[PDB]
Structure formats: C-alpha cells, structure tokens
Amino acid sequence: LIVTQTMKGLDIQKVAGTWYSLAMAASDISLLDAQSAPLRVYVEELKPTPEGDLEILLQKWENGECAQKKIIAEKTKIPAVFKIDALNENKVLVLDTDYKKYLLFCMENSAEPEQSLACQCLVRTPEVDDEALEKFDKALKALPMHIRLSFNPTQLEEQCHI
Ligand SMILES: CCCCCCCC(=O)O
Ligand SMILES: [Cl-]
C-alpha cells in the first residue's frame, strides 16, 4: 500500500462513459518514458458492469501501432478499489471524482521491494481543465512520482495521443 486517498461515497455506475487521459504520473520514469512504456495507457471508456465490476477500454502502443485493449477490474469490499488479475496482483483505486467533469485514479503493484504506481487525471472532454489538474497535483504531493506527462486538446483527439 502507498495510496491512501480514496473517494468516500463512490457511485461506480455514475462513472460510466467517455473519458480522456489528460495527465499521467508514475513512481518510476521507465513506466511512462517510452511511447511503448508499460503504463502509458490512454483511457477511452469506463464500463461498470450491473454487478459492480469495472471494465476499462483503452489504447496503447504495442507494435509500431496503437492497439485497443479491454481490461476487467473486479470489485472488492471497498467501493473505490478494484482488482485486475495477472501474474501479479495489481489494484485500481478511484481517488476522487465529480462524475461530470473529472476523475482521478491510480494503479499500484503489491510488493515489491516497495510498490510502483501510476495515476491519471481523466476528464470528460478534450479540454485542459486547470482545476482537475490542481486536484491531481494535490493528490500527487502525497506520492513518490518521478515522471509526469500532460496532453493538449489536439493530441487528446488522436489515437494514442499522437
Ligand atoms: C487501469 C488500466 C490498467 C493499466 C495497465 C494494464 C496492462 C496493459 O493494458 O498493458
Ligand atoms: Cl469495489
């Protein structure tokens, strides 16, 4: 555990729909450095299931191509925290959202020696929301981040933010 910010009172069904990854940060440079870096993922849509799991549609660079991916994050006993199945146990946490404009979330590993982590500022539209970004930066102050990326509206309308 590293991130101890979660949203009190989350209604997961209300996060459904279109999002844009306006900004991303991570604990290690190599996690976002290259265009093909492991956690350089661009969110397209959040699809909560009727039973409260979180399906995530995204893009990422995998060949010399922007590939689509569909990730399933299963619910836990905590409403703001979800679990993605792999060789390793890695968790999605929702830190804060107003549903209609912005959503902040993190992805974190288990162990490791000492966890690695990436967070994003998701917004509803291809616009630079400075207030969403302030709230993202505030959340990140509590976190050991060493790379931060931000996208302009032009890139936000392109596949893989080209
Ligand atoms: C919450 C989205 C999870 C990001 C990493 C998923 C692994 C991948 O798609 O390569
Ligand atoms: Cl949950």
Swiss-Prot record:
Tagged with keyword Signal: yes
SUPFAM superfamilies documented for this protein: Lipocalins
InterPro entries assigned: Blactoglobulin, Calycin, Lipocalin, Lipocalin_CS, Lipocln_cytosolic_FA-bd_dom
Entry comment on modification after translation: Alternate disulfide bonds occur in equal amounts in all variants examined.
Disulfide bonds: 66-160, 106-119, 106-121
UniProt entry tagged with the keyword RNA-binding: no
GO molecular function, one term: identical protein binding
Keywords: Allergen, Disulfide bond, Milk protein, Retinol-binding, Secreted, Signal, Transport
Subunit architecture: Under physiological conditions beta-lactoglobulin exists as an equilibrium mixture of monomeric and dimeric forms. Interaction with LMBR1L which mediates the endocytosis of LGB has been observed in PubMed:17991420, but not in PubMed:23964685.
UniProt-recorded name of the protein: Beta-lactoglobulin
Organism encoding this protein: Bos taurus
